[PDB]
Symmetry: D2
Subunit: 115 residues, 4 copies
């Protein structure tokens, strides 16, 4: 239900080996960690979470972009890239978090398949 | 396919369906020759746009009718058209995906030239 | 004004007016302490957000209430908020401009470090 | 000035200086006539690019030499050029700012229209 696609805007390839964590907002305004992962070479993570693990609610996906640029040899601006959103996965609703990275800029977009 | 597209609608949060596009190749005299046209499907893609044989190295211009897209959406767009012009280097089984993120008053054109990082 | 913002609305093609934001500084224990808040004017900027005195070297978080902005505009947006987290090195009159481009289902955060 | 530009370099986190550009106006026959050329300064802008008298309503094309910008940076660019094509409606003292966000394999073209 939750997929990601991270692209490197400098190299024109997906951003591989990007560490991420998915958190779910709790009733008291806190966060609970529901999964972690690292993108494969296609800048994707497969079987990140399952349907039952992704009920309606506010989610935060944190991407370790600083480590990504460091490893690539660039010094980046952001300490992390955070994507915080409301998810309504009722039906067939699948979410793709598209992330476009440059050392001093990123774009976070979502593609939400209907039901 | 050596040339793929992926168009996203940044307003609706879905791929941009029914976007008309055309692919032209720069000729020796500096003019443009149209080699393919098409319209994106519901996934914001166009399958079998051109073949490897139709894609020798050279300068290509892919023009997207984003103005009609927004107009059909009931929106007011800025750009007359979205243009992506690039020198293609297909040697070594390099394929291109032209990613395009659309908003009425903004678009982002990115290119992916491998399916994997390195 | 070591810390400036410039927010644009990619749907309307104008700056994003009345966008609420808050600036937090990371503390020794890893937590966040809020040092300023503001709301963008019609040019999508906030003047005199913080002073050089308030902006020492360290890690900062600028959080923009984009959800409220889109809700007010009449759209249902994706993001609950827009978060910009960065290590600042303002020592030496280093200015930071956080440029933010907004659409209901996408935003771009860029930095111009002068 | 009815037509401004603001070019940023997303790799360095600075405006993009010394970017060459050309402004053309579409003619009645579908062709193009050049009305201005310029090069951005260190703030990624070009001052006094054209006058209001030179900017009537119509379709304009602004071509940015981003390929040379990246080549000079020692990088490898994707795009052969960056072109921004739009129907301009300056009536009622509307000015345009073409914002351009550059990375080697990606750029964002946005427009800001203000009543100034
Ligand atoms: N196999 C599918 C996977 C796929 C999914 C999506 I959403 C894509 O678009 C992106 C992704 C990240 C970005 O930052 C931007 I801008 C656009 C691409 I490119 C590929 C396909 O090829 O469409
Ligand atoms: N802030 C001053 C000048 C100014 C105008 C604009 I539009 C700006 O935004 C940009 C520029 C390029 C980009 O690629 C992106 I995304 C945003 C900035 I930063 C500054 C003013 O307008 O008075």
């Amino acid at each position: 239900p939750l997929m990601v696609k991270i692209l490197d805007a400098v190299k024109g390839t997906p951003a591989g080996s990007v560490a991420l964590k998915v958190s779910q907002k709790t009733a008291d305004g806190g966060w609970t960690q529901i999964a972690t992962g690292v993108t494969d070479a296609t800048g994707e993570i497969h079987n990140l979470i399952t349907e039952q693990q992704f009920p309606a609610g506010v989610y935060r996906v944190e991407f370790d972009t600083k480590a990504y640029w460091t490893n690539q040899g660039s010094t980046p601006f952001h300490e992390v890239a955070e994507v915080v959103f409301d998810a309504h996965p009722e039906g067939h609703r699948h979410y793709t978090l598209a992330l476009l990275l440059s050392p001093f800029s990123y774009t976070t977009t979502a593609v939400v398949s209907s039901v």
